[PDB]
């Protein structure tokens, strides 16, 4: 569903994220929790962080978000050939964290927002399109695994 050119744009933009994973991650979470405060309730520790500055000062949050974006980066670099990487993630997010697909849509929106904020010259319509397709492919495939595990 993505062309080789689309995957190159995805990966071009992701190399930029990789220059500061923690900083992009912090911004993505803050944007998620500002836009969709219900999502914060899924994080037993982070939900007690009262302000954007407390969130940026949390080493726990920073460590966590780097783990998250490392997993996302690994999946993107597979250019759709990501079943083996998705399987465990679907398993923990369906069975333990209980994350609905619409919250993966919310975080997808925050990713696009933060990448456009930081890298507008390397993130125009074609690049936004390709990342949107790549994040949609990730969610569709996670959604299929959710069903196989018996989660709604
Ligand atoms: C790009 C989409 C996401 C990716 C790549 C991702 C990735 C990860 C990874 C690698 C971990 C640690 C291992 C694990 O338990 O599976 C994790 C844990 C976690 N994830 Fe996600 N996640 C995504 C979306 C979300 C969303 C949208 C939420 C909530 C609204 C969520 C909530 C959690 C929670 C609550 C944990 C456990 C944190 C802890 O207490 O240690 N995840 N995620």
Can you put this structure into words, describing what you see?
Keywords: Cytoplasm, Heme, Iron, Metal-binding, Muscle protein, Oxidoreductase, Oxygen transport, Phosphoprotein, Transport. It is an enzyme of class 1 (oxidoreductase). InterPro entries: Globin (IPR000971), Globin-like_sf (IPR009050), Myoglobin (IPR002335). This protein has 152 residues and is mainly alpha-helical. It has a single domain, classed as Orthogonal Bundle (Globin-like). 73% of the residues lie in helices and 0% in strands. The protein is built from seven helices and no strands. The longest helix is centred in the last third of the chain and has 24 residues. The chain starts with a helix and ends with a helix. Protoporphyrin IX containing FE binds next to α4, α5 and α6. The site of protoporphyrin IX containing FE has 16 residues, from α4, α5 and α6.
Bound molecules: protoporphyrin IX containing FE
CATH-level-2 architecture: Orthogonal Bundle
Q: CATH homologous superfamily, by name? A: Globins
What is the radius of gyration computed over CA atoms, rounded to a whole number of angstroms? 15 Å
Question: What count of domains describes the coordinates?
Answer: 1
| SSE sequence, one letter per element | HHHHHHH
Family: Belongs to the globin family.
EC number: 1.7.-.-, 1.11.1.-
Subunit structure: Monomeric.
Modified residues (Phosphothreonine): 67
């Amino acid at each position: 569903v993505l062309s080789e050119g689309e995957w190159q744009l995805v990966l071009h933009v992701w190399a930029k994220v990789e220059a500061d994973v923690a900083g992009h991650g912090q911004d993505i979470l803050i944007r998620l929790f500002k836009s969709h405060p219900e999502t914060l309730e899924k994080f037993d520790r982070f939900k007690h962080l009262k302000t954007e500055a407390e969130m940026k000062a949390s080493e726990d949050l920073k460590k966590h978000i780097v783990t998250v974006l490392t997993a996302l980066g690994a999946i993107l670099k597979k250019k759709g050939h990501h079943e083996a990487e998705l399987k465990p993630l679907a398993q923990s997010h369906a069975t333990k964290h209980k994350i609905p697909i619409k919250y993966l849509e919310f975080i997808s929106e925050a990713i696009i927002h933060v990448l456009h904020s930081r890298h507008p010259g390397d993130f125009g319509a074609d690049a936004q399109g390709a990342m949107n397709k790549a994040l949609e492919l990730f969610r569709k495939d996670i959604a299929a695994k959710y069903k196989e595990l018996g989660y709604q």
